[PDB]
Structure formats: C-alpha cells, structure tokens
C-alpha cells in the first residue's frame, strides 16, 4: 500500500504523472484492488483518458513514437485493470471508455509502436468480455467493433490476431452476437473468409492459442443453421484432413472442439 496511494495521487500534475503511470503499471498484478482505487480516485480516470486523447493526432498520419506508445500503453494497462475488476467492470462500460480505444484499433501501421498500441488496446477489450455480460456484447456490437477485429485478425501480429479472435469468439458465444454475425450471407462470409485464410497460414506457421480460438469460432458458427449449411461447403479442408493432427495431440480441449465441429456439419 506504501507507494500505491502516493503514485495514484501523483497521476494529477503532469509533472509527476509519467513516473506514476509506469510505477503503477508494473505493480498492477499485485495490488488486487487497484481498479476500484483507480476508479474511485478523484480525477484519476480522467487523467488516464487525457493520456489517450493526447496522442490522437500522432495516430494518423502515423507518426507515433516508441516513447509515446509506451506511456499511453501504461495508461491503457491501468484501464484494462479497471475493465476486468468485478467492482468496476459495469461502470467502466457505462462510461463507454472502450470508445476511446477505437481510433487506436483502426490504425494499420506496422511499426512496433503501433503494433504495441493495438495489442494493449485489444487487451482492454478482451478483459471487458472475459465475463460474458450481455450488455458488453451488445455494446461491442452496436459500436462496430467487429470490423476492427476482423481487419486485425486479417493483417495484424500473431499476438494481436489472437486477442482479436478471442474477442470475436466471445461475441459469437452469446446468442445475440452469433445471430448478428450470421444475419446476412455477406457478414458471415466475411468472417468465414478471414477465419479461412487464418486456417491456411496456421497450417504452415502453427500457433496453439490462435488455432484454439479459430476452432471455437468455427464450432460456434456451426450452431447457426445457415452458417452450418454454408460451412458444409466452405469449411477449409485442413480442418477435416489430419493436417492439424500432431499439434492438437496435446491440446485435448481444442481437439474435442474440432471433433464436435465436424460432427455438427453434414448429417
């Protein structure tokens, strides 16, 4: 508790806010109640959003430096902290704070500063949907986060693609999210096409976590009657062959899922 209070308090005057963001960002894992402390502290959340908003112009044209990205990501780590705490989770959603991260998620630059910015931003969202609250899914649906996730799964770093897919997975898990993605052949096909190319490169450049999420997504889509029908024709061969046999020999969960997916298709 020692320095935690002082640092939190120091997040005020921009003269000592940088050190506080850093010191706090690292001690986060420890202090289990940091989230409510951050949230309930006067002007602290605003200070964090201030950090986010300050770099909006450097995001496009893409001139964000490593230093800018690191400091803002410190703030984002504290927001992720606030996003997954049971006592602050729901209010975090009321504040529509995730809407402050979307411009970050829209960037496409490849430099590490941007990739780190996007990965950390995705971490906040992933922690938001970790508990399946109906309201968070409906929030993400209506704010158009899906297309942002799709592009990233489609051309981001392996790390970022994993979290983006996990987010799409959570959205798909809920009945509303599943029905929304399958409402038109075009929206389903867009998602299926992306998961498709993911299943092709993953077969030559393996990735356990990513492969696990891609399988869950496909499995979940097989719950919708029309997507199931479509998948009867468009489910990539690599998911039916034995191509993933070896790598799955250790991940019993995902293997069980792929078996269920193949079972669901056809009749």
What is the Cα–Cα distance from 117 to 115, expressed in whole angstroms? Answer: 5
Shortest approach of a second copy to residue 29 CB, angstroms? 27
Long-range CB contacts (< 8 A, 24+ apart) of 142-148? 143/96, 143/98, 143/99, 143/102, 145/98, 145/102, 145/105, 146/171, 146/181, 148/102, 148/105, 148/106
Number of other residues whose CB lies within 10 A of the CB of residue 204: 8
Q: Which of 162, 178, 174, 170 is nearest to 212 (CA)?
A: 162
Question: How deeply is 94 buried, as exposed, middle or buried, from its count of CB atoms within 10 A (0-12, 13-18, 19+)?
Answer: exposed
- In the complex with a second copy, the residue whose CB is nearer, 135 or 229, is 135
Q: Is 220 an interacting residue with respect to Mn ion (CB under 5 A)?
A: no
Query: Which of 79, 97, 172, 202 contacts a second copy by CB under 8 A?
Result: 97
Q: How far is the CB of 121 from a second copy (least distance, A)?
A: 13
Residues in contact with a second copy, counted by CB under 8 A, come to a total of 28
- Taking the C-alpha atoms of residue 27 and residue 101, their distance in angstroms, rounded to an integer, is 23
- Is 132 a binding residue for Mn ion by CB under 5 A? The answer is no
Q: State the binding partner of 91 from a second copy, Mn ion, none, CB within 5 to 8 A by kind.
A: a second copy
Determine if 95 is a binding residue for a second copy (CB under 8 A). yes
Q: The tokens of 8 are what?
A: 């939190």
Using the structure block, give the residue that is written with the tokens 């997975």. 169
Q: Which is nearer to Mn ion, 176 or 266 (CB)?
A: 176
> Per-residue x/- marks for a second copy, 41-60, CB under 8 A?
xxx-xxx-xx--x--xx-xx
User: Least CB distance from residue 169 to a second copy, whole Å?
Assistant: 22
Which of 59/168 has CB closer to a second copy?
59
Taking CB under 8 A as the rule, does residue 40 contact a second copy? no
Minimum CB separation of residue 216 from Mn ion in Å reads 16
Looking at 21-29, 40-48, 114-122, 250-258, which segment touches a second copy (CB under 8 A)? Answer: 40-48
Query: Do 261 and 218 touch, CB atoms closer than 8 A?
Result: yes
If one asks whether residue 99 binds a second copy (CB under 8 A), the answer comes out as yes
Identify the residue among 174, 182, 188, 192 touching Mn ion (CB under 5 A).
Answer: 174
Cβ neighbours of residue 203 closer than 8 Å, sequence gap 6 or more: 238, 243, 244
- Torsion over CA of 52, 119, 105 and 131, rounded to 10 degrees? -90
Distance CA 52, CA 147 (A): 22
Point out which residues bind a second copy (CB under 8 A).
41-43, 45-47, 49-50, 53, 56-57, 59-61, 91, 94-97, 99-100, 102-103, 139, 141-144
Point out which residues bind Mn ion (CB under 5 A).
134, 174-175
């Amino acid at each position: 508790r020692e320095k935690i209070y002082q640092w939190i308090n120091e997040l005020s005057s921009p003269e000592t806010r940088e050190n506080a963001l850093l010191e706090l960002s690292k001690k986060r894992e420890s202090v289990p109640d940091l989230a409510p402390m951050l949230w309930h502290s006067f002007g602290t959340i605003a200070a964090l959003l201030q950090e986010i908003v300050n770099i909006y112009p450097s995001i496009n044209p893409p001139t964000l430096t490593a230093h800018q990205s690191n400091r803002v990501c410190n703030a984002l780590a504290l927001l992720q902290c606030v996003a997954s705490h049971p006592e602050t989770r729901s209010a975090f959603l009321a504040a529509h704070i995730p809407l402050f991260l979307y411009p970050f998620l829209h960037t496409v630059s490849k430099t590490r500063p941007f990739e780190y910015l996007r990965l950390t931003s995705l971490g906040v969202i992933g922690a938001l949907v970790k508990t399946d609250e109906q309201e968070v899914i409906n929030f993400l649906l209506t704010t158009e986060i899906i297309p942002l996730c799709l592009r990233i799964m489609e051309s981001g770093s392996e790390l970022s693609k994993t979290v983006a897919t996990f987010i799409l997975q959570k959205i798909l898990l809920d009945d509303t999210g599943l029905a929304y993605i399958c409402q038109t052949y075009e929206r389903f096909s867009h998602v299926a096409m992306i998961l498709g190319k993911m299943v092709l490169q993953l077969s030559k450049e393996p990735s356990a976590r990513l492969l696990k999420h891609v399988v869950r997504c496909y499995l979940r889509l097989s719950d919708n009657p029309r997507a199931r029908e479509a998948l009867r024709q468009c489910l990539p061969d690599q998911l039916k062959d034995t191509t993933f046999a070896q790598v799955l020999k250790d991940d019993t969960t995902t293997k069980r899922w792929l078996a269920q997916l193949v079972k669901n298709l056809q009749e």
